[PDB]
């Protein structure tokens, strides 16, 4: 895959040019706020278990037709698979937030997912609803605005990282 | 691209785990070392023409026999191509310092170097003598700081060992 540093190099290769001063300064900002990026990511991972159950139970309550007979989350086998793969999507989002590039999310999880969901009969309307809940939960955890769970962290701003998380979850919803 | 970040993400991905403290500890190491590496990459970027052009001269001084007919470097077009390859290698070393690992070197110059040079009859010791001379000029602190020189010399010793 490609991280934030490696994305700069790949762009400079297409022109066969050395990494210029202008691009290097962009990396220096990435490194300077590198403590915030790990400080963001730890918040997402530490609450990964409750984020997914927020999404899956929330998606079902607004669309009760999923658990009705003939639905795609009817039995325990389908419900377990819904939780398992929904957590996989969240796992690859933290990789993208940690690495600073969305290439890892696109290549290893998002590649060919849409064509598979069609074969299994998984509804796309319900899947994107579950993902959009995960983005709202992660952003609230990233900015430290969760209602019932507080983590002690030095005062500062994280609009840059919250905007990063929101865009990564939007890529998943746009692909399928 | 092997680096600090991809090695731990690939290790965590194989086991199916979320990024734990062990993975966040590795990325923290990148923050400490990124200060020194990005000074060496800046120095090389602004002086690649002088380093490359003197490096090629040292290779041909050690091995005058490359000038003879029937050998690599027997004409003026061939000799220019020799300097062009050293520029490519010095360009990937600049990529290695920025990326922070041996990623760009492995997948763009080292992977098939054994078969290509053998097929085209390019001796490997001609490329070795180019990097040894460059590594010998490198002095502290006129060129770069104490830590930047260590980071730069580390990439050059990696390249030589693959041609050895």
């Amino acid at each position, epitope marked *: 895959m490609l991280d934030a540093f490696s994305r700069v190099v790949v762009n400079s290769d297409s022109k066969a040019a050395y990494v210029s001063g202008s691009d290097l300064q962009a990396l220096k900002t990435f490194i300077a706020d590198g403590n915030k990026r790990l400080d963001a990511v730890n918040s997402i991972v530490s609450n990964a278990s409750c984020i997914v159950s927020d999404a899956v139970s929330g998606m079902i309550c607004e669309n009760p037709g999923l658990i009705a007979p003939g639905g795609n989350c009817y039995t325990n086998r389908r419900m377990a698979a819904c939780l398992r793969d929904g957590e996989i999507i969240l796992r690859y989002t933290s990789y993208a937030l940690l690495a600073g590039d969305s290439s890892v999310l696109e290549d290893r999880c998002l590649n060919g997912l849409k064509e598979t969901y069609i074969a299994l009969g998984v509804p796309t309307n319900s899947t994107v609803r579950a993902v959009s809940i995960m983005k709202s939960s992660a952003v609230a955890f990233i900015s430290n605005t969760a209602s019932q769970r507080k983590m002690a962290t030095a005062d500062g701003d994280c609009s840059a990282l919250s905007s990063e998380v929101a865009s990564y979850c939007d890529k998943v919803s746009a692909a399928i | 691209m092997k680096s600090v970040i991809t090695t731990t993400i690939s290790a965590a991905d194989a086991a199916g785990r979320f990024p734990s403290s062990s993975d966040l500890e590795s990325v923290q190491g990148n923050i400490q070392r990124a200060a020194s590496r990005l000074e060496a990459a800046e120095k090389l970027a602004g002086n690649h*023409e*002088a380093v490359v052009k003197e490096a090629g001269d040292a290779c041909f001084a050690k091995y005058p026999y490359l000038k003879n007919p029937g050998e690599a470097g027997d004409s003026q077009e061939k000799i*220019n191509k020799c300097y062009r390859d050293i520029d490519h290698y010095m360009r990937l070393i600049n990529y290695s310092l920025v990326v922070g690992g041996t990623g760009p070197l492995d997948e763009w110059c080292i992977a098939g170097a054994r078969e290509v040079y053998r097929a085209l009859n390019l001796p490997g010791s001609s490329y070795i003598a180019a990097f040894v001379f460059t590594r010998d000029r490198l002095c502290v602190p006129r060129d770069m700081s104490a830590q930047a020189a260590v980071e730069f010399s580390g990439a050059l010793d990696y390249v030589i060992n693959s041609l050895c």
Partner: T-cell receptor
Amino acid sequence: TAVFQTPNYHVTQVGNEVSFNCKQTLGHDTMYWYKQDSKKLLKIMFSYNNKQLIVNETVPRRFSPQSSDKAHLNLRIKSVEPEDSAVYLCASSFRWVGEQYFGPGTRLTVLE
Amino acid sequence: QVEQSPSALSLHEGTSSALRCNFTTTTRSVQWFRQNSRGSLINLFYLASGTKENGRLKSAFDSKELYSTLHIRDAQLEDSGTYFCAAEAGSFNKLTFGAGTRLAVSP
């Protein structure tokens, strides 16, 4: 053998746009446009390797080089001033090793 | 970055002298140029830390001493022209020229 460029001569007035084209038939890859002033002092104005500019000697933005092929190098000058009256020289050489082969050159005259 | 003294030198046939072109920084190679009456520059010498002879001239270059010399002997009528010394000193990227020397021969 040598480098030939066209047109041979070109004289224009203030406000016009001029363009000299140089072509070279050797196996060379780097071309230069030397701007020798009225004092016969040669100062490098543009240098182009393949498709990438490699030399910019604090050239004002009005001078714009347009290169199509490695054997072609044009120059379009806008907002031409009378003070820019000089003799322009086309050069060609290998980028790293080799001597520079010059052409006859072009003279530009601006009329008050 | 090139100082040339004297600016012009008109020598009678048989009299011995030399032409010098001085540099401030290390130079890989020097190109000597000849400008005809039409103003076209014809390449004369191209050497890199060595000695080359062509007709009645000779050139040299010492990298440690940062200078170059040119010697003329038995000037002929056809050798009229302007002498130019160009050095690749600096960042080994651009060519820098000297002031120039004009020589004319009478029959």
